């Protein structure tokens, strides 16, 4: 179970985006949000009620104001050397060493593709691109830069994480089995399509299995998505021989379920 911050900055403000925003993730669930306008880092739904130290959220906001500035700088220092709008993104976080410690991550992407990396131990930015030099040098040209950024990943990160584990279990251990529903549509010509939909289940982990006359018949084409409820939604499609609709069933596997679940039309 990892702690991952998704940071981003843009140039083109034609559609109302802030200039820089961010979101915190504990496993598959968001617990944090931030942007340059609200100027503060705040708790997401279910985490609002977690019990934390008084300065926890003080700390997330101040640590994000730093990164905001490093990104905003890059954005302008780039928008000047180069022609054409940009999108700065970075993936900052950690996973716990199965022996209390950090397993950091820090990669940055520019206009869709990766162009830079940070080593928190060595305190150095790596990268094979022109932009890697522009941005990478802009930051390294700040005394604070390396130190802070590094402490964020090696000290703060693993800490906050270990604290959400202790004080957040109710949330991370939460389980909810899906509600299944199988159906048939006219599909192609002289054919038909079976759809196995899974409703409102938590751990996004789920295994669809098709059954013809009882024996395995495939996996269809799985697609999972968020319900916005904090839960997830999933479906699988299987085109079959028209008329034979009824010889098939659908089965699912999930932690919400003690045993595999079989559904019919």
């Amino acid at each position: 179970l990892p702690l991952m911050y998704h940071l981003a900055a843009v140039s083109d403000l034609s559609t109302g985006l802030p200039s820089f925003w961010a979101t915190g993730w504990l496993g598959a669930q968001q617990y944090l949000t931030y942007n340059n306008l609200r100027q503060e880092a705040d708790p997401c739904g279910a985490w609002i009620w977690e019990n934390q130290v008084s300065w926890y959220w003080e700390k997330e906001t101040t640590d994000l104001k730093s990164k905001e500035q490093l990104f905003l700088e890059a954005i302008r220092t780039l928008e000047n050397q180069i022609n054409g709008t940009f999108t700065l993104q970075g993936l900052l976080g950690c996973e716990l060493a199965p022996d209390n410690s950090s397993l950091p991550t820090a990669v940055f992407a520019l206009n869709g593709e990766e162009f830079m990396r940070f080593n928190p131990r060595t305190g150095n930015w790596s990268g094979e691109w022109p932009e890697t030099d522009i941005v990478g040098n802009l930051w390294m040209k700040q005394p604070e830069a390396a130190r802070k950024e590094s402490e964020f990943l090696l000290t703060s990160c693993p800490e906050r994480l270990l604290g959400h584990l202790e004080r957040g279990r109710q949330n991370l251990e939460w389980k909810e089995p899906p509600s299944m529903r199988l159906k048939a549509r006219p599909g192609n010509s002289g054919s038909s399509v079976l759809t196995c939909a899974a409703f409102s289940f938590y751990p996004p982990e789920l295994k669809f299995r098709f059954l013809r006359n009882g024996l395995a018949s495939g996996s269809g084409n799985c697609s999972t998505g968020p319900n916005g409820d904090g839960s997830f939604h999933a479906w699988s499609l299987l085109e079959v021989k028209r008329g034979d609709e009824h010889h098939y069933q659908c089965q699912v596997e999930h932690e919400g379920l003690a045993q595999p679940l079989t559904v019919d039309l």
Binding site: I82, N111, E128, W129, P130
Partner: protein, 205 residues
């Protein structure tokens, strides 16, 4: 007839830009110009191209173009891009394929050279740049005065040297006065063999 062209070295070497693989089809005396286009990356179809409605030239023959936006690494890592053009008129589909020219990237050594004494009399002088020992011959070179990309320069084509690598010269032209005012002239080079794909050398006095 069909033609396949690789991306500009500039777009490929700078992440912020967009490298495109191009496929052009000429000679079409008005057949079924709805000329289909199929692209593939490592033999996998893709529907991202940007085909541009045909165009008649000064020969009554129709022409067409399909640009495929490409991911900087797909190129640098060796992926093969194929574009197959189809048409009823055509017997069997015509297909072309290209990927980055094989070979260990050898990066250039760059040097700047002032106008020659004997030239210090004419109205305009010549600021020269020697770019040598690079391979493959995929490269980019431009001039900048005080960091301002300039226009009065010509690049020699890359020329295979004796040892297999390539070199080229790039000549910036300017009014003697501009040279003498002490402005800075910079030779900028983008080659995949250089650290961060780039390097630059300035000159003054």
């Amino acid at each position: 007839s069909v033609f396949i062209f690789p991306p500009k070295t500039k777009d490929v070497l700078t992440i912020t830009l967009t490298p495109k693989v191009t496929c052009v089809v000429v000679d079409i005396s008005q057949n079924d110009p709805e000329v289909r286009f199929s692209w593939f990356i490592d033999d996998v179809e893709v529907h991202t191209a940007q085909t541009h409605a045909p165009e008649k030239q000064s020969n009554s023959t129709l022409r067409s173009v399909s640009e495929l936006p490409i991911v900087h690494r797909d190129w640098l890592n060796g992926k093969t891009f194929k574009c197959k053009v189809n048409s009823g008129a055509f017997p069997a589909p015509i297909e072309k394929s290209i990927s980055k020219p094989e070979g260990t990237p050898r990066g250039p050594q760059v040097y700047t050279m002032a106008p020659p004494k004997e030239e210090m009399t004419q109205s305009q002088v010549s600021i020269t740049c020697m770019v040598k020992g690079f391979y493959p011959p995929d490269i980019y070179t431009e001039w900048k005065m005080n960091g301002q990309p300039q226009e009065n320069y010509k690049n020699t084509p890359p020329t295979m040297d004796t040892d297999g690598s390539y070199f080229l010269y790039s000549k910036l032209n300017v009014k003697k006065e501009t040279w003498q005012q002490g402005n800075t002239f910079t030779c900028s080079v983008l080659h995949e063999g250089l650290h961060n794909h780039h390097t630059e050398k300035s000159l003054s006095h």
